[PDB]
């Protein structure tokens, strides 16, 4: 019974059958296809630096009705263009075009977060200092 072989000389069948059914797993495939290297915008890295191209306003999806104040960024090491959310209020004033921001993942390991559609990234540092410091008036943005 039970649909799998059980004989003592049948380890090859069980081992090859486990191998074939491992591919249905989401993260086993990405570990063995190298999807992080080839397909992901960051090259399988926690962080990446970029260059700001434009300020964006993205409508929040239902049932929220705000404007999310994100930016469009082009990375240095890849040249790819990603959209990154700019956190709590006034920070879009602290970011401008061509500030060489630093980016991180947005929490959900390659997925969008909250009511923002199609943004997988956030800004951490702008002009090389912080956003927490600039928001809390602990540091000052360099004159550029």
């Amino acid at each position: 019974g039970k649909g799998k072989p059980r004989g003592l000389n049948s380890a090859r069948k069980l081992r090859v059958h486990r191998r074939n059914n491992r591919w249905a797993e989401n993260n086993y495939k990405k570990r063995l296809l190298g999807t992080a290297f080839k397909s992901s915008p960051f090259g399988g890295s926690s962080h990446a630096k970029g260059i700001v191209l434009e300020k964006l306003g993205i409508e929040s999806k239902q049932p929220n009705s705000a404007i999310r104040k994100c930016v469009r960024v082009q990375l240095i090491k890849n040249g790819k263009k990603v959209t990154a959310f700019v956190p709590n209020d006034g920070c879009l004033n602290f970011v401008d075009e061509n500030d060489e921001v630093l980016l991180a993942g947005f929490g959900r390991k390659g997925k969008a977060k909250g009511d923002i559609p199609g943004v997988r990234f956030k800004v951490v540092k702008v002009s090389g200092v912080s956003l927490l410091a600039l928001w809390k008036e602990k540091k000052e943005k360099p004159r550029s």
């Binding site: 300020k55 306003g57 404007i67 104040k69 209020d89 006034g90 879009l92 004033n93």
Partner: protein
């Protein structure tokens, strides 16, 4: 519309908050002495 978002009013609430300064208070004890304050203040029933 469905093309742009109005980026004009970023920071419109933090700018207009009627700010008030943190009042100076006596400092609280630190380290093992803070667990004294904590774990008597939660058990004052004599």
């Amino acid at each position: 519309a469905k093309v742009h978002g109005s980026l004009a009013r970023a920071g419109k609430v933090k700018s207009q908050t009627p700010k008030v300064e943190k009042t100076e208070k006596p400092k609280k004890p630190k380290g093992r002495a803070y667990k004294r304050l904590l774990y008597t203040r939660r058990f004052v029933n004599v």
